[PDB]
Design a protein around this ligand. Sequence first.
Ligand SMILES: Nc1ncnc2c1ncn2[C@@H]1O[C@H](COP(=O)(O)OP(=O)(O)OP(=O)(O)O)[C@@H](O)[C@H]1O
Ligand SMILES: [Cl-]
Lengths: 929, 85
Amino acid sequence: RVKVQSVETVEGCTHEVALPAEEDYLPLKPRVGKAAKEYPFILDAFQREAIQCVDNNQSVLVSAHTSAGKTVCAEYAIALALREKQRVIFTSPIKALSNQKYREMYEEFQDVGLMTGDVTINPTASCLVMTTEILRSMLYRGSEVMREVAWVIFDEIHYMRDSERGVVWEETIILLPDNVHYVFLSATIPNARQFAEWICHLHKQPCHVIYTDYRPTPLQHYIFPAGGDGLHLVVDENGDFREDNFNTAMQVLRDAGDSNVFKIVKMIMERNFQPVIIFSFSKKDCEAYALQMTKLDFNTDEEKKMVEEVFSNAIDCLSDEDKKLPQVEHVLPLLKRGIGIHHGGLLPILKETIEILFSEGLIKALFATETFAMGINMPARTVLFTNARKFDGKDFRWISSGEYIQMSGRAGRRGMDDRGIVILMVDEKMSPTIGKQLLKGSADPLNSAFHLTYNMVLNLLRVEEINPEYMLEKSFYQFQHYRAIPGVVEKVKNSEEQYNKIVIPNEESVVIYYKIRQQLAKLGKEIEEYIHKPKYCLPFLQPGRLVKVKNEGDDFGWGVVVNFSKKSNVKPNSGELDPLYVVEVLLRCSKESLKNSATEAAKPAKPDEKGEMQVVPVLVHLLSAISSVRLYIPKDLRPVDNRQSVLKSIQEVQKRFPDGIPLLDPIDDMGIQDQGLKKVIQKVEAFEHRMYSHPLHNDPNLETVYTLCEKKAQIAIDIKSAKRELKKARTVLQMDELKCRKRVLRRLGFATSSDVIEMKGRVACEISSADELLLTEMMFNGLFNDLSAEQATALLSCFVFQENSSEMPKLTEQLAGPLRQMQECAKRIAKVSAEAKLEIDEETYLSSFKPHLMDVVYTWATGATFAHICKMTDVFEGSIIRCMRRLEELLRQMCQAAKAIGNTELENKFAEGITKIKRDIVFAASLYL
Amino acid sequence: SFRTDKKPDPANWEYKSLYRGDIARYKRKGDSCLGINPKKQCISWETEKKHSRKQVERYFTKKSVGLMNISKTEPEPISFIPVKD
Ligand SMILES: Nc1ncnc2c1ncn2[C@@H]1O[C@H](COP(=O)(O)OP(=O)(O)OP(=O)(O)O)[C@@H](O)[C@H]1O
Ligand SMILES: [Cl-]
């Protein structure tokens, strides 16, 4: 019900407007009167177009690169809003982002406010800067602040695709009235028009997408190949890709040419590439590198004093006991020497301090974690990527175009640089097709991540003229599904043609052979399953035995057993249940694999590669083959060379048996007497008879024929799959889930059958920072009534601590008493959710709460100093602090809830819980505000 | 190197742990288990190096060289920028 018109513009800038279909497109109108705002600089073409949209009272989405100058459009709209005397609210995604914008907005326009969970300043300001999440609550409350608002600005709107907080952006947009106009600031996204159509469709008014690829300060990208003499220019200042350099850089990796980050950093200071941001994906790596830089000093003594006055000055607020912390103390020398680190783990008082320092020029090198790019933008002249590849947590991969685009977009300073330099350090061979995508590829599409939450549902039930269902229908998620339907149909037809084009396997009976081979593979896996049952395999797990390890698609080939142990489950989210059998096996792993400490990161060597032997413990079921061969193993495997020796031994047996290294028969040798395996063996034997009967096997060009059959089979699966996707075309995707949630809500007593919110439901609305359903139910079980004040807050740490820590600390009964108590309560909810047809598993829900910092929080609550609590746990300081900050956040969500159900005692226990918790460095605010 | 032994050692199963083996000294990869799938399971085999760690802290007390302070503003898109070893 929306059409798009394209409008002509000049300097490589695009203007399109999506309008409601029943309204005639009319060209924008030239300004009558003076400009609302005037700028120091001559505006860019993209800025002017957008400004004209605001002058003309229509919404615009501006999508341009970071530092292009998207921010001026918003400023002009505020200026217009203020000029007409109506209000405006500018929202930012993160608290950090908002503060920076608060200040930035404060300079230009006098009447400004900041609304964050933590701070509230000038709430009835003409221009109010708030975090978008706060805005959503404001919409739910039905508050007065929205009353004179004519324009809302969403800055960095492209973080809407983020999974956890993405929904709030969408939800906020839905809640806002049709009368309001928007300015959207975002980075360059491919589907910018699509977003604009949704706004028009939702708000029944025009939204303009103004898109430009302009970069005010151009960038020249380089790739340094490890072991290479120098950096190569892969992409130019003009955005072009130089393959010759890529290939040339790549060959050096082949070592057919004819890699410290220390070295890269040294040249940058030497060649006046000066401030540089070095990116590492590990917190530990960022720190490791930083130390290495300490050998060289990048600061003058005048600057050295400057670093210390500001540092010390920031730190003055901090309690002297907090000021004496090791975390604080050891950082200062680095700063003094021009080195900085910025990562998630570090303390916030220091984090901000380094950011301040970098802006002053005191910090020449910054080694920061990947989330620095997702931060208040501080640009640098050069950006260094220590690695081109990333670990997903499952598999290794290269960085995505969007990932590159964000990090490499930190390079180039508008006032200050003629060029921006981006450096990619690359340890693995990269293809031209793969490389071209990384550097010259597009950003991620802003695809929504709407999801249903109980708070969303409850609050919608609570509000008067809206329902939960209305939110779904009007969502972006739905819009995209509807809009993407034409493609699914097209894919089916095109796929259908493909099946026909390739439907020339020469004799149609090959499908039958393929099915026989497929059956064998299925059965073959069935045999293996019996062989790795612990009873049968433990007897053969002898050091030096040759074994094959395959783990869900990455198969390691041959390994040698080094040791075996039986371990018990210490999960302990769920019950202990069964004990796990772990075998430690020396496998041939990737060069990339060895670099990651984690057990999960092990991966098989690549085809090009030599490989390296590592002993990695694997579970019993991952061994696909066991062999007769046992080999000699040196007794210290620690050295590469000694571990390397097994690889040669393995090949010596491989060379010796080229018909395959021998395997133990399950019955003849393993002895597994399970009757069912014999049947599998018989069935495998039978198909082998069938397999040899077939003509195809003997025939020449069998492989060519079979491959077509595999190809043909693939399209059918895709055709079927697409057809399934098409079947859901006229359906609202998440509505079924809402109803399932709705049933759960009714059963649990939160709301009635006729969708009227109930008193239990009302309490739950307040809790938006955690699992509200459990907490109110826990409140209604009176669990909180008898708790220690410290226990009450410590128990809640599990509600908001999400980070992955290795393990919990055993707890005194006061802390773990409630821990026992919550899990049953959690277990009960889980029982009902399953009953209501939802997808969850009881072990998982129960183990989604982490008690790892339970002790620590209690200890902090009672009056312990921050320094003391750090000793207790291995999670980093920043992580600890973050959890506490959310803890205060949750307590306030909890405090309010108590008022709704009128327990004064509960309000005070929780409200005094904050006071024990909220003190000193943990709650400082130095990011200047 | 190699030999073929087809002979089972029942102790491992009966006693729950390895018997009849000479164990090497080795460092394993990490603290988990490869197979473990949902991480609905955790096991314990049962040493940080942070910035404020003592080994690290004495490196800063020990001084370092300063290479270049204040020639010109910067330098185009040159295809190869070298950097010595
Ligand atoms: N025409 C211009 N001439 C000079 N400087 C400009 C111009 N337009 C913008 N700038 C400068 O551009 C810088 C970046 O603008 P802004 O911070 O709004 O960037 P952005 O990346 O578009 O937005 P965001 O803050 O949302 O990331 C500002 O310091 C601003 O002064
Ligand atoms: Cl080794």
